[PDB]
Amino acid sequence: MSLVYMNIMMAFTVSLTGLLMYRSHLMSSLLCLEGMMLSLFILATLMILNSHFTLASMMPIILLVFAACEAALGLSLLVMVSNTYGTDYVQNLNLLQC
Amino acid sequence: MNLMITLLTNFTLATLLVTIAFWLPQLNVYSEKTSPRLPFSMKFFLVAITFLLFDLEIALLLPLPWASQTTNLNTMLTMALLLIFLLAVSLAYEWTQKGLEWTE
Amino acid sequence: MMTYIVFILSIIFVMGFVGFSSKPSPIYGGLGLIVSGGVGCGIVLNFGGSFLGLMVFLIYLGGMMVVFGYTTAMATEQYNKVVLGTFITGLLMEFLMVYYVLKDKEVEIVFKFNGMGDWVIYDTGDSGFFSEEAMGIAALYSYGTWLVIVTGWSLLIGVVVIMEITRGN
Amino acid sequence: PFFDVQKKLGVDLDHWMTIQSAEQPHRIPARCHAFEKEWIECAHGIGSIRAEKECKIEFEDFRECLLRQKTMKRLNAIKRQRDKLIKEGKYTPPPHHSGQEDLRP
Amino acid sequence: PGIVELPSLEDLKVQEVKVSSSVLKAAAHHYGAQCDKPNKEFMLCRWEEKDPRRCLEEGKLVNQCALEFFRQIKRHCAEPFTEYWTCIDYSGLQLFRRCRKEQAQFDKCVLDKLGWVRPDLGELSKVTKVKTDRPLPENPYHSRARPEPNPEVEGDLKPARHGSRLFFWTM
Amino acid sequence: VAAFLKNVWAKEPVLVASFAIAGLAVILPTLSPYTKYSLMINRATPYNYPVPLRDDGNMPDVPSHPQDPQGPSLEWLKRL
Amino acid sequence: MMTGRQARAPLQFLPDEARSLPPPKLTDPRLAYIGFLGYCSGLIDNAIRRRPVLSAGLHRQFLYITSFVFVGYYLLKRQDYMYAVRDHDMFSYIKSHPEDFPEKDKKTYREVFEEFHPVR
Amino acid sequence: MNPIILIIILMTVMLGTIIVMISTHWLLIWIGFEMNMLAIIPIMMKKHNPRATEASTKYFLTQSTASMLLMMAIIINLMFSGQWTVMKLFNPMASMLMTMALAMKLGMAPFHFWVPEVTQGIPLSSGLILLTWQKLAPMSVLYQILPSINLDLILTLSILSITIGGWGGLNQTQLRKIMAYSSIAHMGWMTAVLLYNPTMTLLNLIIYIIMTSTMFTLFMANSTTTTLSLSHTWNKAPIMTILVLITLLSMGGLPPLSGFMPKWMIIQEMTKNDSIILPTLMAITALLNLYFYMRLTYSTALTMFPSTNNMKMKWQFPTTKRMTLLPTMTVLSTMLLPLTPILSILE
Amino acid sequence: AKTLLHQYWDIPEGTECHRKTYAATSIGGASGLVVSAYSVALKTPTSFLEGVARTGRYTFTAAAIGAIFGLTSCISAQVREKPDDPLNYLIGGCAGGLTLGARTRSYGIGAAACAYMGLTAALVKMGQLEGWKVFAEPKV
Numbered sequence A: 001m002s003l004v005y006m007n008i009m010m011a012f013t014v015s016l017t018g019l020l021m022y023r024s025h026l027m028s029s030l031l032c033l034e035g036m037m038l039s040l041f042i043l044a045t046l047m048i049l050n051s052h053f054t055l056a057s058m059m060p061i062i063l064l065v066f067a068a069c070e071a072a073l074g075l076s077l078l079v080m081v082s083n084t085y086g087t088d089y090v091q092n093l094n095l096l097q098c
Numbered sequence B: 001m002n003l004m005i006t007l008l009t010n011f012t013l014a015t016l017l018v019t020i021a022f023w024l025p026q027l028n029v030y031s032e033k034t035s036p037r038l039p040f041s042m043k044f045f046l047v048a049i050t051f052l053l054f055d056l057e058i059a060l061l062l063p064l065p066w067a068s069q070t071t072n073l074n075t076m077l078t079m080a081l082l083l084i085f086l087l088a089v090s091l092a093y094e095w096t097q098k099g100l101e102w103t104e
Numbered sequence C: 001m002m003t004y005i006v007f008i009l010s011i012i013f014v015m016g017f018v019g020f021s022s023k024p025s026p027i028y029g030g031l032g033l034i035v036s037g038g039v040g041c042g043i044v045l046n047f048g049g050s051f052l053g054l055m056v057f058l059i060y061l062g063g064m065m066v067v068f069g070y071t072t073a074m075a076t077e078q079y080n081k082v083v084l085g086t087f088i089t090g091l092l093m094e095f096l097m098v099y100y101v102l103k104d105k106e107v108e109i110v111f112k113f114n115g116m117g118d119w120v121i122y123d124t125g126d127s128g129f130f131s132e133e134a135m136g137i138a139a140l141y142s143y144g145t146w147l148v149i150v151t152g153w154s155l156l157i158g159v160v161v162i163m164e165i166t167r168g169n
Numbered sequence D: 001p002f003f004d005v006q007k008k009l010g011v012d013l014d015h016w017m018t019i020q021s022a023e024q025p026h027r028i029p030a031r032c033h034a035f036e037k038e039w040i041e042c043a044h045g046i047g048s049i050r051a052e053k054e055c056k057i058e059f060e061d062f063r064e065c066l067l068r069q070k071t072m073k074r075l076n077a078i079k080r081q082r083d084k085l086i087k088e089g090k091y092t093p094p095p096h097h098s099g100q101e102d103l104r105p
Numbered sequence E: 001p002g003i004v005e006l007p008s009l010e011d012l013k014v015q016e017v018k019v020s021s022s023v024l025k026a027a028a029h030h031y032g033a034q035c036d037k038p039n040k041e042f043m044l045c046r047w048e049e050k051d052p053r054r055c056l057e058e059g060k061l062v063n064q065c066a067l068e069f070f071r072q073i074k075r076h077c078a079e080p081f082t083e084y085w086t087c088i089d090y091s092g093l094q095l096f097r098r099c100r101k102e103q104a105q106f107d108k109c110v111l112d113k114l115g116w117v118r119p120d121l122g123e124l125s126k127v128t129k130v131k132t133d134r135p136l137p138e139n140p141y142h143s144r145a146r147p148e149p150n151p152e153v154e155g156d157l158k159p160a161r162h163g164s165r166l167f168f169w170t171m
Numbered sequence F: 001v002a003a004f005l006k007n008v009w010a011k012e013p014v015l016v017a018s019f020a021i022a023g024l025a026v027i028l029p030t031l032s033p034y035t036k037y038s039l040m041i042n043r044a045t046p047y048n049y050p051v052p053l054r055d056d057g058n059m060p061d062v063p064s065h066p067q068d069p070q071g072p073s074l075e076w077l078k079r080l
Numbered sequence G: 001m002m003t004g005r006q007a008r009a010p011l012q013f014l015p016d017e018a019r020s021l022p023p024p025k026l027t028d029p030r031l032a033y034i035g036f037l038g039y040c041s042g043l044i045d046n047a048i049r050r051r052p053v054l055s056a057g058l059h060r061q062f063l064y065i066t067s068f069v070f071v072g073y074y075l076l077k078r079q080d081y082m083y084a085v086r087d088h089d090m091f092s093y094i095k096s097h098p099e100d101f102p103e104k105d106k107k108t109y110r111e112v113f114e115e116f117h118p119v120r
Numbered sequence H: 001m002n003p004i005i006l007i008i009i010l011m012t013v014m015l016g017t018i019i020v021m022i023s024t025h026w027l028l029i030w031i032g033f034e035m036n037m038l039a040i041i042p043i044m045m046k047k048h049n050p051r052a053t054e055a056s057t058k059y060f061l062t063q064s065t066a067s068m069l070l071m072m073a074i075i076i077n078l079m080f081s082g083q084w085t086v087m088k089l090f091n092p093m094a095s096m097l098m099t100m101a102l103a104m105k106l107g108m109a110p111f112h113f114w115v116p117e118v119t120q121g122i123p124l125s126s127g128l129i130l131l132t133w134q135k136l137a138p139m140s141v142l143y144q145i146l147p148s149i150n151l152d153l154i155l156t157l158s159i160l161s162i163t164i165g166g167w168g169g170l171n172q173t174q175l176r177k178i179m180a181y182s183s184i185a186h187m188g189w190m191t192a193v194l195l196y197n198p199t200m201t202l203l204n205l206i207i208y209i210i211m212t213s214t215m216f217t218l219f220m221a222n223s224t225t226t227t228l229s230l231s232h233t234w235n236k237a238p239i240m241t242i243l244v245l246i247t248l249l250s251m252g253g254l255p256p257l258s259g260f261m262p263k264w265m266i267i268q269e270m271t272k273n274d275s276i277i278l279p280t281l282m283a284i285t286a287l288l289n290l291y292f293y294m295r296l297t298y299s300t301a302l303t304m305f306p307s308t309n310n311m312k313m314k315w316q317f318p319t320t321k322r323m324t325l326l327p328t329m330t331v332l333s334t335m336l337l338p339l340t341p342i343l344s345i346l347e
Numbered sequence I: 001a002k003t004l005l006h007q008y009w010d011i012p013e014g015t016e017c018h019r020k021t022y023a024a025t026s027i028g029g030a031s032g033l034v035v036s037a038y039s040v041a042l043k044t045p046t047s048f049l050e051g052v053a054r055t056g057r058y059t060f061t062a063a064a065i066g067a068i069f070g071l072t073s074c075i076s077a078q079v080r081e082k083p084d085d086p087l088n089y090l091i092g093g094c095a096g097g098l099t100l101g102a103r104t105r106s107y108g109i110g111a112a113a114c115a116y117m118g119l120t121a122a123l124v125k126m127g128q129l130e131g132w133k134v135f136a137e138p139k140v
């Protein structure tokens, strides 16, 4: 198929493996999650413009709106975590081992 | 193409003026001046998230000048007034539960 | 060279994702996602998605990454070997992919991909006095009634949810 | 649990965005409208098991319309043989493939 | 699969309408009024055959009728037409609203010398009917034989033989 | 109801103007005589090509030429 | 399995062809067991709120019994309907495919030789 | 929380699950999962303690990752099929991604690693919603995509779920972690029979929802979250120890109780398809589940652990808690095995 | 790692000993790499050297189990001349069990691994004989 689809899929896998490998922060995890959303947006848009399927032109906007509301919800969870522990470090979220 | 040339020209002029503003006052070798978490507000985050969600509702509202050209005007007018009504209901709920307070 | 412009922007897109996914800090991670969103917007604009690329710049980069940098400023102090090593690992893997697909004009990472530029797959017609993508987005109100109902309800519920869970009581 | 409420009540909640051959705004056809219409009218009602084997030809034509893999492979073959013959000096491009022929209309 | 069957280069040669888009836009309404019938035969052949290789003679009749249309303009009303399409050609969006006096000159000379009436608002967008002599295409999509459907259910619904037959449940 | 309306127009005139303008926007297109002409102009704007019909022999309402009398007309739009 | 049957007419709890079947009797032992489940629910409801188990809430025990019998009648009707549909589809598939269900020749034991294994 | 806002949020959870159940378009499936997650986050943060914020953060991360993999599977479906119908998937990579995404949304092993943490972090009512109501939408999608699910993948996920949910509860004393590992093992039972007979999947789902709803309602009616706090139930309300006894002996798959019905019908439909080793290992691995259930029954009903003196004050007060449908759910979770051919109503 | 099992099972029993030994060694080494990857996934080692030490230790342990399993089974199939026989894989399974006891530095773990892994390898041989399906394709 098209060559750009390989690159957008590989960008999704890069932000996947970044989201699937935490370093220290939770904000870096949310940035990798929204990079995954960005690659979904681009790849869906290239398919829909590529096929001239008219009605699905409203699909990437709905993807954007729902996952940005999801991003706001995750930022609110991050705010509550950082207010509890002082930092957004994921190693402070460890009380559920016992 | 002409847009990309214009963007590159604006970026180049901006970068050239930044280079002048940082390097031209480094010509006149001055004296060597040797003499010698942040507090959190919930209201800043709530005005940022209220902006974000109202901007998503704006993202729904932006194709209305194109939506007015439709043949299904009863449905289009209904859903247009319904989205602006849900933006107003979000604003009313943001009002009455003390969300718009001390940054009103 | 200029026929490969969407491919060049997609390689810049992957390089930017390898950049912020290495995660030096959420500050520079946000900057890398901003640069990546700009070049992916360029990818969208070069297929004819002018409204959707301005939705990138206006909604994604215009509100959401603003809220991410806003929260990064407010919930993190103001600013390695692993970061730069994983960065050069991702850069070498992506340039080896570029080298393979430019020397063979064919590659198979997971599926098979053509090595020519993606100008080949475009249509040879016109859309008249309208944009197809603009009229499909205008169809959100006439044809997309239930989609507007569930999206507006999810945004209303999202306002309610954030006002409940950030209250702390 | 596919509670088919849309067919029980007779509402059109999401059937319209489902396929490319549906009713489009201002009667815009997709790039693979005919192939998808042929595959759907092949596979309609016969079930998925019979559609995997009895509608293979329409579905292969429709997938090759969507992704254009055989088309781009054939164009790769023609262009690679063309560049190889320019490399060997056994071929020269015609004036209608060099930009010096004052296009048709 | 099969070899695609293209027409020859001699099947595509026709005397072109080598005029600009503002020239075509200036006499567009008189072109729609006067060159109605072969244009509509062509667009009916084009939406019914769904193949431009089945429409070459109709396109050649379109081109012949357009050439006769502009030759009939040029012999009688060449100078008000040139005055009109130059003023249409000046504008970037090529507005009709900017050039109503040159339009009045051209329409006046055309009605006086050629008897052509410019159509009213609404007329060129009408769905007309076309009397063709070619047969109706029996399968323009070249659709092959459809698969036979699964057999339907029939008969009165009798009870289950000895209940559920689930190991020992006699009902 | 008029004492409360004067009270809220004295205290909060911005919100009274807001709910009044929104109320007009809700209820007024159902009472306008020109709401019909919005539909009639939007459906009579020719974005596509008017693909003609094969003349079978009995279609008296479909014209054979644009300048024929029968067919849909836009005299109402020229006049209003 | 039978999802293509209940897809032409979806979300019908009992279709119009369910009425050609005999309904359960009111002395169906399955429905009587469902009534026993209702009486047990009434007894547990008197027990966990520390009422007298047999005495308290005879109206409530009676509504438990009545409610379970009322739900269970329609559940038994849909059970009998789906097994009747299963048998009907099975028999129509055997009838519409003779080449897949060949008549196996029944041989008596005078022809059928079976190996004897002595227990000694 | 405001009771009106609580009711609107619970209707939004139910509405997201219904939008997944009824819709024919993949974007509406993804919208339904987004609506479900977005509305169930405040139910988990009802009490506003740091364990609920931690649990809601981990739940958000896993369900967000699953939703992005789900939309990627939908996008590759639009690549290789040009359409959006919720049916079989037209690519094995999209099938693998969607099976992973739905396994993450269920919390099946090896993506099980959020379920005991999030279940322990949140209250018993929100844990009841998480372990019963949230299993409905991904199992609906798995019911809808079963002509394209890879068999080796779903059976690997199922046996890994059963084994890890068996060995998980053997080390536990907290009741919410026990119910979560029970959830992992039972979702393994449900998806092991999916590509063979999904009616038995729906049967196992309904019986498991009834039994889990019974156990969480008993835990709410006794206000016990640990094994050792559940131990004092014989001195407070002795009928509750009988109910947790019969319900835990049901959930272990012991006949003549109706928790034996799902796994017996699953073995009954897997041996038809010439699989003998796999339901044998499933049935033998269910003994671990039954072992920590028997640990709970020994601690609660079959013996009498020592109580304290302040129990004498709680002797003077009745249960004012709304024990909604607890006798109904108790009778259905134990005495339903004579009504076993009622499973045809799920055909 | 499916083609590893393909290039293991297709070879007749008691014919080519070094190739079967290396095929089972590769199967064991791949499984040990999987166990090592999950062990360094869920549990963080104290450094990089300790992590690669645990990785190499588990990988060589499972590779030695696979090597001595395939070697003992092929040598038993040669000295008994019964190629489709589960006692050969029983002796191979007990040899792998004694190998695991040698690697884990404990005798009782070796005896239990002898018994259970020998019965497991016998069951795998009988599944290869009668065609037992663990991931059985749906037919009804």
Ligand SMILES: CCCCCCCCCCCCCCCCCC(=O)OC[C@H](COP(=O)([O-])OC[C@H](O)COP(=O)([O-])OC[C@H](COC(=O)CCCCCCCCCCCCCCCCC)OC(=O)CCCCCCCCCCCCCCCCC)OC(=O)CCCCCCCCCCCCCCCCC
Pocket (backbone or CB within 6 Å): E168, E169, E170, E171, G027, G028, G029, G030, G032, G033, G036, H256, H337, H338, H339
């Ligand atoms: C004109 C209009 C008026 C006409 C009036 C006609 C009727 C007049 C009499 C009025 C009363 C009618 C009662 C129902 C009809 C008779 C049903 C019957 O006996 O079926 C035999 C049935 C099968 O034997 P059969 O010789 O082949 O059939 C003779 C007839 O043809 C049986 O007929 P069938 O072939 O059509 O039966 C169909 C099928 C035949 O059965 C089968 O195909 C076999 C499968 C049955 C279920 C097996 C499940 C095994 C695993 C779970 C075990 C659970 C624990 C066991 C009990 C623990 C303690 C509670 O039935 C079922 O599958 C239904 C499920 C079992 C419920 C049986 C009915 C109970 C009604 C009263 C409930 C009171 C509580 C009873 C205890 C609860 C447990 C039953 O026997 C059993 O399954 C044995 C279990 C006990 C049955 C209950 C006996 C009913 C009377 C009980 C009175 C004493 C209650 C004491 C207090 C409560 C307990 C502490």
Ligand SMILES: CCCCCCCCCCCCCCCCCC(=O)OC[C@H](COP(=O)(O)OCCN)OC(=O)CCCCCCCCCCCCCCCCC
Pocket (backbone or CB within 6 Å): B085, B088, B089, B091, B092, B095, F008, F012, F015, F016, F017, F018, F019, F020, F022, F023, F024, F026
């Ligand atoms: C049905 C029409 C469409 C309605 C939906 C669309 C609305 C569009 C405008 C968007 C408005 C969004 C925000 C609305 C919030 C309302 C709640 C509110 O603000 O209550 C507080 C306010 C008192 O303000 P306070 O709390 O003191 O704040 C300090 C500021 N000085 O309380 C008040 O001041 C009372 C406010 C309510 C009374 C206003 C009445 C106006 C009546 C005009 C004539 C009738 C209009 C037709 C509609 C019927 C209205 C009942």
